[PDB]
Design an enzyme around this catalytic site. Sequence first.
Site, PDB file in Angstrom:
ATOM      1  CG  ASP B  17      37.371  39.232  33.116  1.00  0.00           C
ATOM      2  OD1 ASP B  17      38.627  38.601  33.496  1.00  0.00           O
ATOM      3  OD2 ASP B  17      36.386  38.981  33.526  1.00  0.00           O
ATOM      4  CD  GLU B  96      40.314  31.984  40.476  1.00  0.00           C
ATOM      5  OE1 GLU B  96      39.888  32.845  39.867  1.00  0.00           O
ATOM      6  OE2 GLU B  96      39.449  31.501  41.322  1.00  0.00           O
ATOM      7  CE  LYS B 132      41.500  36.776  38.145  1.00  0.00           C
ATOM      8  NZ  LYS B 132      40.124  36.336  37.263  1.00  0.00           N
ATOM      9  CB  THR B 157      39.418  36.976  42.454  1.00  0.00           C
ATOM     10  OG1 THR B 157      38.242  37.224  41.684  1.00  0.00           O
ATOM     11  CG2 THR B 157      39.605  35.460  42.772  1.00  0.00           C
ATOM     12  CG  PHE B 179      33.551  39.378  41.348  1.00  0.00           C
ATOM     13  CD1 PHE B 179      34.846  39.411  41.326  1.00  0.00           C
ATOM     14  CD2 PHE B 179      32.994  38.301  40.767  1.00  0.00           C
ATOM     15  CE1 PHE B 179      35.724  38.576  40.873  1.00  0.00           C
ATOM     16  CE2 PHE B 179      33.706  37.352  40.288  1.00  0.00           C
ATOM     17  CZ  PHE B 179      35.096  37.328  40.310  1.00  0.00           C
TER      18      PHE B 179
END
Lengths: 322, 322
Positions: B17, B96, B132, B157, B179
């Site tokens: 990430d 994203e 994303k 996400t 998350f």
Amino acid sequence: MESALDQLKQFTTVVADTGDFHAIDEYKPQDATTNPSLILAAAQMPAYQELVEEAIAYGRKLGGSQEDQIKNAIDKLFVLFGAEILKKIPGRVSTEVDARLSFDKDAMVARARRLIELYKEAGISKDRILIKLSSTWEGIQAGKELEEQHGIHCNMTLLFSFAQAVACAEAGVTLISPFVGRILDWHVANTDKKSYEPLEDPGVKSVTKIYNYYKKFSYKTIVMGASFRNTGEIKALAGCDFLTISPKLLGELLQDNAKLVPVLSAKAAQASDLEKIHLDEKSFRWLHNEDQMAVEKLSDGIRKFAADAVKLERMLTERMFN
Amino acid sequence: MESALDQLKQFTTVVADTGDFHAIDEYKPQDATTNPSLILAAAQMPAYQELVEEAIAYGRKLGGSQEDQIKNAIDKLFVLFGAEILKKIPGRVSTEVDARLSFDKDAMVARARRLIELYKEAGISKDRILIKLSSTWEGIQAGKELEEQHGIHCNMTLLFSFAQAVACAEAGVTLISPFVGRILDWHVANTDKKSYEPLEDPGVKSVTKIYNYYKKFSYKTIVMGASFRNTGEIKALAGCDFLTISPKLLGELLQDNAKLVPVLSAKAAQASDLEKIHLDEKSFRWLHNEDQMAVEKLSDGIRKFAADAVKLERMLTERMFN
């Protein structure tokens, strides 16, 4: 006249926020409001157990599954409180459809027509009723449909963001009820400023802004401030179309007699610098999401009401199905 | 024996990430992930100012208003970081679309196709890309449309509630990134507990639950735990399809070598008790609203990303237009 309450009645139409209709006429309001939390509270009062038994019998009489009976009993209970309230006042009463339908547009519409029907069966005209709906996009659309397709007047509640206020205006709903104290609660709990001058109260500012926008652009939707923590917030909104106040605060406004000055007006709203805007669903949801307080209060507001509804159902089933 | 990282690679596919692709290959991940936040960080690094200048040159060429040229520059910047990352790894990278489109279904779709195009112009196949999208109902619907109508793979996400997880599964999206640490943050800040056992970590439980539901009912969507506060949460999820970890925690997993035990497994999930459910928009929004943490984290997650996007735009316009 002389008291703060009677003075407020010169600039604003006072509405009583309660299900306890025995304490109403003491303040001589124009309209009255009730919500899931108030009906629950009152339904548990010894004085109104008579209405509960009638509601239960209605459930029983219409028959069907137990669910048909708890629903019809509760629907009738709301209507019963509504009718009693109406005998005490000259205006309208607000009856809210279950908060659990907040995201179901068609269910809110059908349920609203149902309530209007029950009232009709009791000889009450819909002109005396305001159906309260959660101010979610679907609730607002339900409001729009109810007003335009069925001539049923709505009270858009749990209104917190400016976006909600805008969507409601364009939806041409009859009335909106912006919560003031709950906005204060959020700012008190989250920001580090636990106190505000009446005029600086976040809740008062949201309603002031909304009022100026409505008047400046000629929207005929009625602005009715709601849910108050103190009378300072109320006085800081003197001049608003309507203000629904609790019996407790009404009593305080009846006790004191300081000079009350109007604050909101069509002339001040016309001088404010707000610009007209249009919101479709996309823009609405975005503009609304930008308001954290509104996102969180509307969301929690829906859960709390739903819970009050769940608690009312339970006690009733336990009461009519042991 | 071996390091915790290499052990985890036996049960789970590790993903890095970050936008700082120079620190990638040290951990040999399969895929990589980036977001409006990481890119922001990345572009401000001296080492990558070269990519920024190329992105800028790209935007001026397409022309339009300052906001317009800034769009193509930013779109290209993302793509550039993406391409560099891809040279370091064997799998896919996640790019994203602007968080400000979270409630605009058609904008997310069009923008996604646009990114896939830019990558295509750079000789990168879409099979290497995961777009994303914020996990709002519209973002999920955008995902559905992208997968079914354009064969574009998505990474849903900011997924917090079980409702989101369900809607994504039925939407048949390629991957979801629940998350974990942000769920911990919410419970730490709101409830009164400060620390949990890896297995009791609210975030870990949300992902565990989601994983079991997916496997038990044969959904092929890839479950990828994301955003971690510590390695305990990571170890408590060993067995998950994928886990995108920060360089910092990857480094910690590479340093310790305690025995790692798998915790999640499809067979275990299949032999569990969970009921399949279907969610249309109404049910979804309701079930989601019942999860306060999810409502608040998804909402704040969107504002934060949007802000990172606003900050990146500003810094760039100031850089290419002063």
